[PDB]
Amino acid sequence: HMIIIKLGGSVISDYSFHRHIVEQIAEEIAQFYPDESFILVHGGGSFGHPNAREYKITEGLVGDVDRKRIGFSKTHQAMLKLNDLIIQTFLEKGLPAYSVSSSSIFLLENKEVVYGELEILRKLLELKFIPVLFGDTAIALDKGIDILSGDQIVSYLAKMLKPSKVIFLMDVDGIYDRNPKERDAKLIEELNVEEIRHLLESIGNKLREALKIAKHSEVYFINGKVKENLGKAIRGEKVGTRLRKLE
Amino acid sequence: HMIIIKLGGSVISDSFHRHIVEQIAEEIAQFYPDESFILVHGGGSFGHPNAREYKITEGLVGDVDRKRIGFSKTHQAMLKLNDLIIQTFLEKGLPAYSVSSSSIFLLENKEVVYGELEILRKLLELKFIPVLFGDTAIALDKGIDILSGDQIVSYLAKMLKPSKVIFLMDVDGIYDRNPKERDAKLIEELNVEEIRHLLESIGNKLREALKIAKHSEVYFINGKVKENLGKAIRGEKVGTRLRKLEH
Ligand SMILES: Nc1ncnc2c1ncn2[C@@H]1O[C@H](COP(=O)(O)OP(=O)(O)O)[C@@H](O)[C@H]1O
Ligand SMILES: Nc1ncnc2c1ncn2[C@@H]1O[C@H](COP(=O)(O)OP(=O)(O)O)[C@@H](O)[C@H]1O
Ligand SMILES: CC(C)=CCOP(=O)(O)O
Ligand SMILES: CC(C)=CCOP(=O)(O)O
């Protein structure tokens, strides 16, 4: 009875910010809160990618370690600024969004969460709060520092909290049989593991994490810039790309 | 071999005293990275108004829908002040990293009864400087509550057992009478019996200090004079000194 919604990076922003679509997402959620429990995870957007790439966080604690520590902290602060933008938008619509710093509760190894703290998340959901996490800088056991993607957060949360469904808000209507740039690109309504592996053999992080998530939850990939898509996915109606739970 | 420094809300705000934070950072730089440091700061003029307004200390009672929104608003203001302090520390070349207190702690009777400490340890190991703040917090009894900096410091003292805990205050230390009286005398060496004498006649800080002294040496110093922090870190004579309890 809990839904995890992953706000795409290109969805919420591009240091830009699309207030209108965040209001749309909040209004959509308000039609189901507080009857359903929601965890939100928002991407780095135009706030975290600048500093992460400028400081090359994914390289680890190598070379100029002092500059990399400073940039680690600056990138986290920028992500906190974006998180505040989103949280304020959600509060304005009457929804009690509450911020949870991903780097405070997660440890990384090989881009994957290998250590987590979920009790405060559980209690937040129990008191009918909407916890809002974000792709973040994170301490990595192998390379000191790394970038924890929102997809990995969602996969850890999926395998630990076993939500009812996981909804990915993307810039496209769902998963396509080819690159949507191409002219003949067709949208896959019902996704299966066969076409997922076929697509991977030729974004890929998203398909891999979705393969893992589908073990525990039903997955949706929808276009987050159209309001009714979120409600349709929450209500289980036909919308976007559906990846049913692997049985 | 690690020192916890608690920045009182009166020296960091009451508003933002950038110069005092800059002095604290310049003093800390004399020991980084040979000494491990954790920093906790209060609400000052950021979390105190919101917490007084939304009546967070009453818990989840009355109009709870407003209480949740105010809980979140207070946390966001705390994050804003935290960012001010963090950016100040970063400009001076110290890798201060923001740890969200409400993300890793759970309260009962205003005391931390649940806590996540592994990320703090990993931050200290990788020569980072964690910076926590007095915060809003989930309470197991009243739903929501205000987690003060003194309680954070007492919990971290129990768990991590720092070499010392240093309280930065508006005054030179613990006095005989109130410092507003002309004849007040500064107690340069505090013991259990002098503490107990003082309580029977701020008191929260003294109770927490009595608890902390079981694990660590405590210093009460004036945060407005730059050199006091370094005098306390090196163990020199400064302010009030509560030695670690023996038998
Ligand atoms: N078959 C496909 N179906 C859907 N999207 C695709 C496909 N092939 C390539 N893409 C592109 O990959 C992108 C995936 O975004 P992604 O990188 O997962 O977001 P984030 O940066 O938040 O992780 C989409 O914007 C889309 O343009
Ligand atoms: N016996 C005393 N010795 C020293 N200071 C005192 C005493 N009694 C009251 N005070 C004053 O009361 C004020 C309360 O400070 P407090 O708000 O507890 O610190 P913080 O800002 O860390 O919470 C202090 O600034 C201090 O000047
Ligand atoms: C700070 C940062 C780039 C986090 C990861 O972003 P995303 O969730 O992978 O879009
Ligand atoms: C959010 C809030 C009122 C924090 C209070 O912290 P502190 O007791 O001033 O250290």
Q: Mind giving me the DSSP string for B135-160?
A: EEEEETTTEEEEE-HHHHHHHHHHHH
Report d(CA B224, CA B239) in Å as an integer.
Answer: 12
Structure tokens at A208: 């891999």
Report d(CA B1, CA B37) in Å as an integer.
Answer: 9
Give exposure, B189-200, as e/b (b: 16+ Cβ within 10 Å): ebeeeebeebee
Task: Please tell me whether A176 is known to bind a ligand.
Answer: yes
Please give the backbone phi and psi of residue B88, each rounded to the nearest 5 degrees, phi first: -60, -50
Kindly state whether residue A164 falls inside one of the protein's structural domains: yes
Kindly state whether residue B234 falls inside one of the protein's structural domains: yes
Strand order in the sheet with A136-140: A112-116, A106-109, A136-140, A144-148
Report d(CA A110, CA A142) in Å as an integer.
Answer: 7
Tell me which H or E stretch contains B184: none
Environment class of A195 (CB within 10 Å of its CB; exposed 0-12, middle 13-18, buried 19+): middle
Is the distance from CB of B77 to CB of B46 less than 8 angstroms?
yes
The Cα-based distances of B217 to A153, B31, B202, B244 in angstroms read 39, 18, 19, 5
- Which residue range(s) make up the domain with B44? 2-242
Report d(CA A87, CA A210) in Å as an integer.
Answer: 26
Side chain identity at B151, as an amino acid letter? Q
Task: Please tell me whether B114 is known to bind a ligand.
Answer: no
Query: In chain B, positions 134-153, which contact chain A (CB-CB < 8 Å)?
Result: 138, 140, 143-144
Nearest Cα residue in chain B from A73: B97
The 8-class DSSP code of residue B204 comes to: H
Tell me which H or E stretch contains A30: helix A19-30
Task: Please tell me whether A63 is known to bind a ligand.
Answer: no
Contact A104 B104 (CB under 8 A): yes
The Cα-based distances of B74 to A35, B102, B116 in angstroms read 25, 11, 22
Experimental approach taken: X-ray
**Among B234, B230, B241, B247, residue whose Cα is nearest residue B27:** B230
Side chain identity at A158, as an amino acid letter? A
Neighbours of A205 (CB within 10 A): 11
Q: Which protein residue's CA is at the shortest distance from atom 7 of ligand 4?
A: B42
Report d(CA A96, CA A115) in Å as an integer.
Answer: 27
Neighbours of A159 (CB within 10 A): 14
CA of B76 to nearest chain A CA: how many angstroms apart?
Answer: 7
Structure tokens at A50: 């600048």
Is the distance from CB of B96 to CB of B127 less than 8 angstroms?
no
Kindly state whether residue B247 falls inside one of the protein's structural domains: no
Residue B188 is part of a domain; what is its CATH number? 3.40.1160.10
Is the distance from CB of A185 to CB of A178 less than 8 angstroms?
yes
Side chain identity at B31, as an amino acid letter? F
What resolution in angstrom units was achieved for this structure? 2.5
**Among B133, B54, B65, B104, residue whose Cα is nearest residue A130:** B65
Looking at chain A, after which residues does the C atom sit over 2.5 Å from the next written N, breaking the chain?
Answer: 14, 202
Neighbours of A183 (CB within 10 A): 5
Kindly state whether residue A205 falls inside one of the protein's structural domains: yes
Environment class of A62 (CB within 10 Å of its CB; exposed 0-12, middle 13-18, buried 19+): exposed
Report d(CA B221, CA B12) in Å as an integer.
Answer: 14
Is the distance from CB of A137 to CB of A148 less than 8 angstroms?
yes
Is the distance from CB of B50 to CB of B74 less than 8 angstroms?
yes
Report d(CA B201, CA A70) in Å as an integer.
Answer: 48
Report d(CA A207, CA A199) in Å as an integer.
Answer: 9
Strands B36-41 and B129-133: parallel
Interface test with A, best of B76, B81, B133, B136 (most A CBs within 10 A): B76
Ligand at shortest distance from the CA of A78:
3
SS3 call for A172: coil
- The dihedral built from the CA positions of residue A74, A75, A79 and A81, taken in this order, carries a sign that is positive
Report d(CA B106, CA B112) in Å as an integer.
Answer: 6
* Residues making up chain A, counted from first to last: 247
Q: Following CA atoms A235, A11, A7, A188 in sequence, which dihedral angle do they give, to the nearest 10 degrees?
A: 50
The domain total for chain A is: 1
Report d(CA B163, CA B149) in Å as an integer.
Answer: 18
- The dihedral built from the CA positions of residue A50, A54, A60 and A66, taken in this order, carries a sign that is negative
**Among A119, A178, A148, residue whose Cα is nearest residue A41:** A148
Ligand 3 centroid distance, CA of A10 (Å): 10
Please give the backbone phi and psi of residue A148, each rounded to the nearest 5 degrees, phi first: -90, 110
* Residues making up chain B, counted from first to last: 247
Return the CA Rg of chain B. 18
- A-B Cβ pairs (cutoff 8 Å, strict): 114
**Among A154, A149, A166, residue whose Cα is nearest residue A45:** A149
Kindly state whether residue B55 falls inside one of the protein's structural domains: yes
Kindly state whether residue A56 falls inside one of the protein's structural domains: no
A34 half-sphere exposure, CB direction, 13 A CA radius: 15
Kindly state whether residue A142 falls inside one of the protein's structural domains: no
Kindly state whether residue A70 falls inside one of the protein's structural domains: no
